[PDB]
Structure formats: structure tokens, C-alpha cells
Amino acid sequence: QEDISDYVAANMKDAISRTSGVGDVQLFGSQYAMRIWMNPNELNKFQLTP
Amino acid sequence: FSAFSSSRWEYGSPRLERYNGLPSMEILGQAAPGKSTGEAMELMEQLASK
Numbered sequence: 001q002e003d004i005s006d007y008v009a010a011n012m013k014d015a016i017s018r019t020s021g022v023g024d025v026q027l028f029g030s031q032y033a034m035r036i037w038m039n040p041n042e043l044n045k046f047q048l049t050p
Numbered sequence: 051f052s053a054f055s056s057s058r059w060e061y062g063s064p065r066l067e068r069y070n071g072l073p074s075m076e077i078l079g080q081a082a083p084g085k086s087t088g089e090a091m092e093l094m095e096q097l098a099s100k
Contacts, residue, residue: 014071015070015071018070018071
């Protein structure tokens with residue numbers, strides 16, 4: 001699902017929302033973001049903080 | 051700067067174009083004398099198809 005949503009957001013949503021007669025275009029998903037899923041145990045191991 | 055830097059010569063675009071939110075390159079042309087703009091545009095489309 002996240003792969004399809006990213007393709008729609010990055011390749012189709014912008015062009016469609018700019019099409020004649022189109023008002024609000026709402027994405028049923030979300031574009032990719034660089035997700036850094038932090039682990040508090042590993043952050044502690046090195047005395048690090050987000 | 052030499053203590054914490056390295057220097058290189060590379061290539062890059064002095065002017066980046068975009069069309070409708072996507073990277074683009076513009077090409078200007080003229081139909082050959084004795085020909086219409088429609089047929090020239092058709093040939094350009096046929097060439098771009100490849």
C-alpha cells in the first residue's frame with residue numbers, strides 16, 4: 001500500500017490537482033518520507049537523545 | 051579548509067527547467083519551408099515516440 005500511495009503522490013496527485021476543473025484532491029495514502037524509527041535502548045546504549 | 055575538505059571539478063546544469071512540476075527541456079523549431087506547422091508537430095511527436 002505504501003508503495004502505491006507513494007507513486008500516486010509523487011507522480012499523479014500533483015498533475016491531477018492542477019487539471020482543469022479540479023478543486024481539492026485528497027490522497028488515500030501518503031507520499032514516502034525518510035523514516036528514522038529510533039530505538040530508545042540503542043539511544044541509551046550510546047548515551048544519545050533524539 | 052584543506053584540513054577538512056577535498057576539491058573536485060565536476061559538471062552541472064547552469065539552468066534547470068521544469069514544465070508542469072516535472073524536470074523538462076525546451077526545444078524550439080521551425081517547419082521547413084513549404085510545410086505547415088501541423089505536419090512538423092506531427093513529425094516531432096513521431097520522433098519523440100521513439
